[PDB]
Symmetry: C6
């Protein structure tokens, strides 16, 4: 009864810790910094400038979800049915979803592009209202028998930024964002899935949204452009992992190395 | 089912791509820059100064909609009925609709002007509330048996600009705009129509409304005055078309060359 | 069913045009500048300083409405029944209605004063709420069988200006005003009557209200004080008439010359 | 029918003008400046500094209302029942009602003080909400069978000034005030009574409340202190009376000369 | 019927003055300056710095209410039944109620302390809403049969001051305060009880809350510290008493001299 | 009857004091400064910079709750039943709860860590709404049969601080804060339990939230860093204890000295 009130005993916390599964990024170093891969029941943020690869990682994650081998879990804790026919939701904030990139990534990966597209729900959000409502509707998707295992918010803050210009209404912006973050954390946890969000950085080195976002994101990264198609992801916040940097590349095959 | 919620599988996206039809502008160069013509399912923005041709293109579009040969589409994906007895909605926020100019453009196009007027609904909006409400009521018009295939918003921002003065209400202005842009995209998508919007520019060049408007418009142009009756439309934003310029003219015949 | 939704076809607009009737101002020059007289289906604004004659023109219009020979219309487009037993509504925001001036003007015009006073409804409005509500209640007067054919708002902006002092509530002011402008245009349109409004000006030359008012008034005048009882009305905005000035007098008889 | 809607024909306006009655102020010169006495159906304002005699005039009006001979009216237009058992309402905003002063003025005028106190309702208002609600409830007092013929608001702006400090809420204060003025004029008009209000002045020389109050007060005075107990009431605004000054005194007998 | 609407005839007002009773403060000088003691049907305010004795006066009053000889009234206007089993309500804003101080004052006064504690209702208010609701619930305590004859608000403004920072919120703070003052005056008046409030002062010399409070407090004191155990209460606002100072002391017995 | 209305007689207050129990902090000096231990029916605040020991005290309290020898109470006033099977609520605002730390503290204290984890409900709050709602839901946990005797709010203000930036919202922040403080006090009082909260400090040494928080917290500490693992807890606000400092240490066993 208590868990229905949003509470969890210390024992409930430990138990649920065993049902955590992870999704590979197709990058050795990146998976390593992640301590296995992208964790479920948590929100992972990739913040950087445009072209840094935040969106590539999002597309790559939708493809990988469709490869049974890219999902790592404790067999005696997570049944094979729990992760069967896994579906992905991609909330698109600026029209960044590219089906052809999904195909390309699928092909070079030996996955059926057709299947990734068929199992990835795309929601085009033109304002913060839609963005937040789509997130909440993910429960409805799961209620219609869709095993949503990956939620992608690309991007987390552009609609809020575009709607709240002026530090005179920043509090209203922060509260709405905090509400969205609670929703994102709620579905990662209640539906044992991984939630990923992309974000931008401001002038001195912080992801947009302040602490309201930061205190609510379990894993946080800054993504920088190396030379050429190289990228470096820096994990600077995680509950128990060490801060570390991982280098990788973005090619015709997607995320690699 | 998922579609009921606003989500589209990647496969659905590809499928909807096939039903996109285009409307000619009566200018080869502009049509070529558009990659064929003004696209259904998208919001196309024409931004420029007063007298730059924005309103003329809107009128030309209403006339052209009444000539079957001016609509281009895949006869394998779009039935004749889908585009039969097509009608236009012209939401006029400053009193720019001119039935006599419609008559003229039609006459010179070998199109009956009476037919254009009989199939063009004009909605005079004196404030932003009326403007947004009219846009929402387009669904009610369709539901009455009117095959709306062209929606013109001339102009998109004059009302919002006349109401929200001072950067102290900008947030509210931006949120109302975002709501309007969402509705415009919804009409274009759910009813497979072409949605055109005219807009102004501000001081190195930007269409009024910032990113809330920009991010939500699929095709964006800046229209400039050339010598005499000449004009140049510069497409600077599109999903996959190259950024190019097209020259054309505004004559007694309408848009030409 | 479309007109029920506030939409009108191009054809409906032309048909609309055929039923327009005009009201003489008693000034040959002003009538000429107007293209015959004050048009129904449009809002006509007279802006200027106190004493420029705006209020005098409003009273003169109420008197002239009671002279069948001062209403010009196409007999084959408008029945004598539509313009029969015409009544006026005068919404007064500063207590400028003078029954004695009505009497004096009538007498000197060979019109029965009592008939003018008996067919002129006066509404004293002390704030914008009353002002706007009276305008909306004009529809109710009509249902009860009153052939309202002339609506006077003297003055248009006095109350809004007295309530929304400070450019900090200007946005709300502009929106309330836009709502009122829409209602005034609706009365003129739906009930085929002439709507006149008085207004003030400010510096380097503009009627109070900005574009929210400007875009919503079809005929716009600046009225200036000439020498003695002479006045000059300058039409600087109309759909198709030329910009021109008219000189007249305000005498014991009312508007003349 | 049109009466229900707040509208009145020019004829009704003239008619109602015949039912106006006046209340003597006990001062010959002041009664003369007033054109006979304080008029019913109008709001009369007395603005001045503290100690200028405003409150004394309010008390003297409550006393005089109980002497049948201090009410002047057209016996052919106003019935004796209309002015029978007249009662006053004194809305007290700073605890200025003084029953002993009523007693003193009454006896010195040969009126039974007990009768005055017995027919004078006092409403102590501690904030603007109470002040306004009390004024609206005067209608309910009349609806219960009380012939309310005099309404005193002492003072009109006191509570508004105390509540709306800072000019960032001035618009809200001006609108609330405008709503209050509407109510005061409504009771004067609908129940044919005299409404008196006291007010303060500020820097040059203007009653507090601006035009919102000013356009809504039919007769306006500035009361000044003369030598000793002498006072001068200056009428600076009236519909058809000349602007003039009246000197009078405040003694044990009340207002005199 | 008029009283039901909040109005009172002038006769009513006089009838009410006769039922006024007073509560001794234990200080000869203070009682003399008050005209006999703390008056019922009025709000009495003691303003000053921390340690000036405001709270001690509140405590002494709760104790004194339980000694019949400390209540002064006219037997012909107030029945012994009306003042029998009197009870006090103490609204505590910072946790200043001290049962041990009550016991002490009682003991030294020959009054049973348990009787005092048993007949004193304490309400700990942590914010303005609770403070305001507690005052309104006093009516409910009375309806339940409790003869509430004294209400202490310690302090009047602490919560309001803690919740409202910025001159841009001052308007809302003043209106909430005005609503609270209305309630305090209403219970003093309707239930014939004495209402006491403590307040702070600010720079030049005024009690916090401005005129909204000042205009609504019938008796007002500034309480200063003298030498050692001495304190001076200065009555500077009363409807009919002279402005005067009372010196008293805060001792083990409580208030004395 | 009055208990329902939120009022407590002075006798109720004394009787209430009789049932207060205290919880050991495992620090002899700190327990001494506290007059015995953390008191039920009160809110105790620990303010200090990050790493000062606040969160550690919260964890140590959850652990100590499960050792009956650490709860001190009057057996004549409090039954073994009231404190039997006590449970704790830990509202986690930044993700600071650590089950492993709970295990370690228990283990080294001779307490079964599994028992502590099993009887401690954790609530992760990502915004002020959630934070406040969990607090209120504690009534539900108790209703469902859980003997909640310890409530931890870690931290009290990080969410409010992250949501309300700028002085233009400070009033709204203070009021939300006030409501939350009232709720915390209410559960401490009604369910006879200990309520602990952690807070930050700013600039000239004050806990965040100002007086709105300060006035509502019965025991207030500023916790600072000594040398190495030493810490000093300074009690600067209590109802009857002396202001004093207690040095303690944070080690593998937990809070000690």
């Amino acid at each position: 009864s208590h868990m229905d009130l949003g509470f969890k005993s210390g024992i409930d916390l430990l138990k649920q810790r065993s049902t955590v599964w992870k999704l590979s990024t197709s990058s050795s170093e990146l998976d390593s910094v992640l301590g296995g891969g992208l964790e479920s029941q948590s929100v992972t943020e990739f913040a950087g400038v445009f072209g840094s690869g935040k969106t590539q990682i999002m597309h790559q994650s939708c493809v990988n979800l469709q490869n049974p081998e890219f999902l790592f879990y404790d067999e005696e804790a997570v049944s094979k049915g729990e992760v069967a026919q896994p579906k992905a939701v991609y909330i698109d904030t600026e029209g960044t979803f590219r089906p052809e990139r999904i195909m390309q990534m699928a092909e070079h990966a030996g996955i059926d592009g057709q299947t990734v597209l068929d199992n990835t729900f795309v929601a085009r959000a033109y304002n913060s209202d839609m963005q937040m409502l789509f997130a909440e509707k993910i429960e409805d998707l799961i209620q219609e028998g869709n095993n949503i295992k990956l939620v992608v918010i690309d991007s987390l803050t552009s609609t809020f930024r575009n709607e709240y210009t002026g530090r005179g209404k920043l509090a209203e912006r922060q509260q709405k964002l905090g509400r969205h973050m609670a929703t994102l954390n709620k579905l990662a946890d209640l539906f044992n899935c991984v939630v990923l969000v992309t974000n931008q950085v401001s002038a001195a080195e912080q992801a947009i949204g302040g602490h309201i976002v930061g205190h609510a994101a379990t894993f946080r990264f800054f993504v920088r452009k190396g030379k050429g198609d190289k990228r470096v992801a820096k994990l600077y916040d995680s509950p128990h992992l060490p801060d570390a940097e991982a280098i990788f590349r973005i090619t015709e095959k997607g995320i690699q190395d």
